[PDB]
Amino acid sequence: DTRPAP
């Protein structure tokens, strides 16, 4: 659950 890339 790492922040997704834009």
Partner: antibody
Framework: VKLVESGGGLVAPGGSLKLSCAAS????????MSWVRQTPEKRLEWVAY????????YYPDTVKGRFTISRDNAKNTLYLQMSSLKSEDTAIYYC?????????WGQGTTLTVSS | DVLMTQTPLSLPVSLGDQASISCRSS???????????LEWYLQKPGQSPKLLIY???KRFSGVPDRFSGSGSGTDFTLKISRVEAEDLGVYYC?????????FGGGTKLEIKR
């Protein structure tokens, strides 16, 4: 994990300035990196993203077209090239190792856009 | 953009008492993948911000057990159960679900003594 920013200082409006960040304590090429600035009003604004490979450089429209994020995975260094500098850009700029979120922050380097 | 509005602006609290900080977004912040990327940061005086919570309620490594996150929809809440003096500073909420990623304006935690 240590992140050290450099290159801050005074710049005339419309001018240009590039920041550096020295990364250590981890595999630099494995992680995506971001820049976040804090205005004198102590407002936080994300200003740039780049993935672990040096790709997908992403910016908000407030700085898009003027700022350029990059990295030298050989030298463990993250860069922020600025140009056409406005007074609104005056802020402390933080170098960040991103994974879950903004997991690790540098101590910052200050930009001042003033005549 | 997603507007993040924090409540209150300042929060005086005695040691051992509880502190609660609210964050409200201008829209739902569920990513295309179905997850909410709401994060809480603390900036202690003279320091860089520090990540406390990510994914609404997940503690980042090193963050004590007394920091709790919750919420969904547009309302999100950071709770501090037994305030210590080292907890003073400014708390920022943040959404990483929609670009541009945006911060809240901050809530200052003040220790009553």
């Amino acid at each position: 994990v240590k992140l050290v920013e450099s290159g801050g200082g005074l710049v005339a409006p419309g001018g240009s300035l590039k920041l550096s960040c020295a990364a250590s304590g981890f595999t630099f090429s494995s992680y995506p990196m971001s820049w976040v600035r804090q205005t004198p009003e102590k407002r936080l604004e994300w200003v740039a993203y780049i993935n672990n490979g040096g790709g997908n450089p992403y910016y908000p429209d407030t700085v898009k077209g003027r700022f350029t994020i990059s990295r030298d995975n050989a030298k463990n260094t993250l860069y922020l090239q600025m140009s056409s500098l406005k007074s609104e850009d005056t802020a402390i700029y933080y170098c960040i190792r991103q994974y879950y979120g903004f997991d690790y922050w540098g101590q910052g380097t200050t930009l001042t856009v003033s005549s | 953009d997603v507007l993040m509005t924090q409540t209150p602006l300042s929060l005086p609290v005695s040691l051992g008492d509880q502190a609660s900080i609210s964050c409200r977004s201008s829209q739902t912040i569920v990513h295309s993948n179905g997850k909410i990327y709401l994060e809480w940061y603390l900036q202690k005086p003279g320091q860089s911000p520090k990540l406390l919570i990510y994914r609404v309620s997940k503690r980042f490594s090193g963050v004590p057990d007394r920091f709790s996150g919750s919420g969904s929809g547009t309302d999100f809440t950071l709770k501090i159960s037994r305030v210590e003096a080292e907890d003073l500073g400014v708390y920022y909420c943040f959404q990483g679900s929609h670009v541009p990623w945006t911060f809240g304006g901050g809530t200052k935690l003040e220790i009553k003594r």
